[PDB]
Design a protein around this nucleic acid. Structure first.
Ligand SMILES: [Zn+2]
Lengths: 156, 205, 121, 50
RNA sequence: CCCGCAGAAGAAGCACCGGCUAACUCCGGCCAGCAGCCCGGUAAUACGGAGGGUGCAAGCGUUAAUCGGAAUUACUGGGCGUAAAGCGCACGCAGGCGGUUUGUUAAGUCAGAUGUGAAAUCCCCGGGCUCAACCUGGGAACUGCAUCUGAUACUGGCAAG
RNA sequence: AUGUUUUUUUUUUUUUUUUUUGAUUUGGUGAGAGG
């Protein structure tokens, strides 16, 4: 039922007395095609192991996102470190208009229809985080009503 | 202006059966449908994000037999039109005269249908239409003319169709050899394997 | 930045100069070879790269790379240059198979890019 | 046989969640019936009750 | 435009396949050559040829040129302790902005109308050329400008606090 | 007293078993024996 996308895998080095010890970082993201999303960042001497670790990480510490049908509920900005991200709800049929790491996270989340630009840095790890933040902060109509002491029809 | 080469190769490349051959003989017997074409067929590494989309696009294009510029134009039209873009595009594709003919069962393959259309066999509302890209409208009867009604190929095609599932959005008569395009098809009526969304995304680069 | 400031003095558009100014917004230009020679490229590469100093129609004296394997060019040979820089001071390529510059011999792939006619058989 | 005693469309697919002829080889669209297959898409014991 | 005649007949190339970037193998020595940015010194998927593939297709590449990507002049929409970026510090004219209450005005602001904003073009619904491009009917739009009639919260003017 | 004073590529691959709700495959007829 859960779908899992390895966004990026990057080789990182540590210099020691002998020379360079290489290792691999795997950035993954998992989701159930509904609100639940979670990214994981795993590290190991070999790639597959790292990926596995990342997946494991992702599977715990997931996060829920309120989705009005296939799309978002309102335009939402999300920032994290360099990567600042804008994403805007869009009409059925338009698809996920978004770039790179950002796209992957959206896809797993089960948003089908978005218009999304990543300003600033596009460092996958940061940008995915930013996206997640954006998703998280995004409140629903019901939630807003609850907050404000009103009905849903009062808010429209 | 047409793809004239090996048809099964395309299918192999795609992965699926594209219905580029009549369906008398099963596709697995005619070719290694699982294995990709060329010297490096058995090797199959996971494709990129762009690449998958591209592949999807190709598949659809291949299925209908529409070259790139035309496809692009169609996409644009769909975008312009109200409602879901991918769905619209699909509808447009369906609407093609040759495609309609194929659906009806006057052509064994889509290629055959196209050929028939070209050769002034088909009429739309009693007027000979020669263009394969002709967008057939709702309530537009489309028939074989009396000259081409004697052809053995047509009957074979019909027979083949009869084995094949009948589309709900048409109504065809085997004896009269005239079908009514009743309505533009819903997305549910078409094949589920086609990811229109990917195609849409590809052009929304 | 401040709106008032902007009003006072608006934002300057970055004027990007053309990296092929001897063309003067022409797709190609005709030129006569003042001299033809080989030159050694900068680090880390190693070769004798064939190049010709060309006096152009519009008056400029430039130096143009000669692509492909082998060339017929001499001094006083009328050639067409197209723009494109080889990665010191060469910002143009001779169009092979135009005017006096010949197509490359015995070439069968990317033939267009070296002026070569289709091989008959 | 399509369509004889032991049909596809009238009853169900021999294999579980598979079009016997060729489409749906995972667990996403359980139900679609293409014209090339004229087949339902359910369980292996679904034909025992139909 | 239509009808008849014959016979698969007269009709497919161009670029690319190291990564970005869809497509991989074999055979020929930092040369010959490639290159948009980041190969070649004898097992080169990067040079040249072949076979195989990929993308476009009566075109296909290259060059030039413009916008885009470039939130990389940032009105929308950036910054300035260390990355480029706070005048060495002040005073201060012009300029910009201006606490609070009432009254008034109605300049800004908002609303409605009238006149205009050529036609074509763009966009919407239609129609006509077998379809399409193309042609074409009606609409919408032309974000504005002017004038008249209102509204007076906010900003401004004037008067008193 | 002093060090940019012998660098050359000796190069990286994007979705199933969801912490114990799931796969190893054999139908009638007739004859004979044990209790
Ligand atoms: Zn099926």
């Amino acid at each position: 039922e859960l779908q899992e996308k390895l966004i990026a895998v990057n080789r990182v080095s540590k210099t020691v007395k002998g020379g360079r010890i290489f290792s691999f970082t795997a950035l993954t993201v998992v989701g159930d095609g509904n609100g639940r999303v979670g990214f994981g960042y795993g590290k190991a001497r070999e790639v597959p192991a790292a990926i596995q670790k990342a997946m494991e990480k992702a599977r715990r510490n997931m996060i829920n996102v309120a989705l009005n049908n296939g799309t978002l509920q309102h335009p939402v900005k999300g920032v994290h470190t360099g990567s600042r991200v804008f994403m805007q709800p869009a009409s059925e049929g338009t698809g996920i208009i978004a770039g790179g790491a950002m796209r992957a996270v959206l896809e797993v989340a089960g948003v089908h229809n978005v218009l999304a630009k990543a300003y600033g840095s596009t460092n996958p790890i940061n940008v995915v985080r930013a996206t997640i933040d954006g998703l998280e902060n995004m409140n629903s109509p019901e939630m807003v009503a609850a907050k404000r002491g009103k009905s849903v029809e009062e808010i429209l | 202006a047409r793809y004239l080469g090996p048809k099964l190769k395309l299918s192999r490349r795609e992965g699926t059966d594209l219905f580029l051959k009549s369906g008398v003989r099963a596709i697995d017997t005619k070719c290694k449908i699982e294995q990709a074409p060329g010297q490096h067929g058995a090797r199959k590494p996971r494709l990129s994000d762009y690449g998958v989309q591209l592949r999807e696009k190709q598949k659809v294009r291949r299925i209908y037999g529409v070259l790139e510029r035309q496809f692009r134009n169609y996409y644009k039209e769909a975008a312009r039109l109200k409602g879901n873009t991918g769905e619209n595009l699909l509808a447009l594709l369906e609407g093609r005269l040759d495609n309609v003919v194929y659906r009806m069962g006057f052509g064994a393959t889509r290629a055959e249908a196209r050929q028939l259309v070209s050769h002034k066999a088909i009429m739309v509302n009693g007027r000979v239409v020669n263009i394969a890209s002709y967008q057939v409208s709702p309530n537009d009867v489309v028939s074989i003319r009396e000259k081409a009604k004697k052809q053995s190929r047509v009957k074979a095609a019909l027979e083949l169709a009869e084995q094949r599932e009948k589309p709900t959005w048409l109504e065809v008569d085997a004896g009269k050899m005239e079908g009514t395009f009743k309505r533009k098809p819903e997305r549910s009526d078409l094949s589920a394997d086609i990811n229109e969304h990917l195609i849409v995304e590809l052009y929304s680069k | 930045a401040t709106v008032n400031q902007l009003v006072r003095k608006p934002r300057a558009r970055k004027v990007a100069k053309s990296n092929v100014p001897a063309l003067e917004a022409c797709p190609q230009k005709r030129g006569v070879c003042t001299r033809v020679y080989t030159t050694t490229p900068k680090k880390p590469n190693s070769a004798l790269r064939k190049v010709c100093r060309v006096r152009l129609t519009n008056g400029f004296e430039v130096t143009s790379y000669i692509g492909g394997e082998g060339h017929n060019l001499q001094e006083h040979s009328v050639i067409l240059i197209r723009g494109g820089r080889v990665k010191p001071g060469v910002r143009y390529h001779t169009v092979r198979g135009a005017l006096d510059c010949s197509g490359v011999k015995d070439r069968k792939q990317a033939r267009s890019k070296y002026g070569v006619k289709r091989p008959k058989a | 046989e399509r369509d004889g005693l032991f049909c596809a469309r009238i009853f169900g697919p021999v294999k579980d969640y598979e079009c016997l002829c060729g489409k749906y080889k995972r667990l996403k669209h359980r139900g679609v019936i293409c014209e090339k297959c004229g087949v339902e898409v359910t369980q292996t014991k679904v034909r025992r009750e139909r």
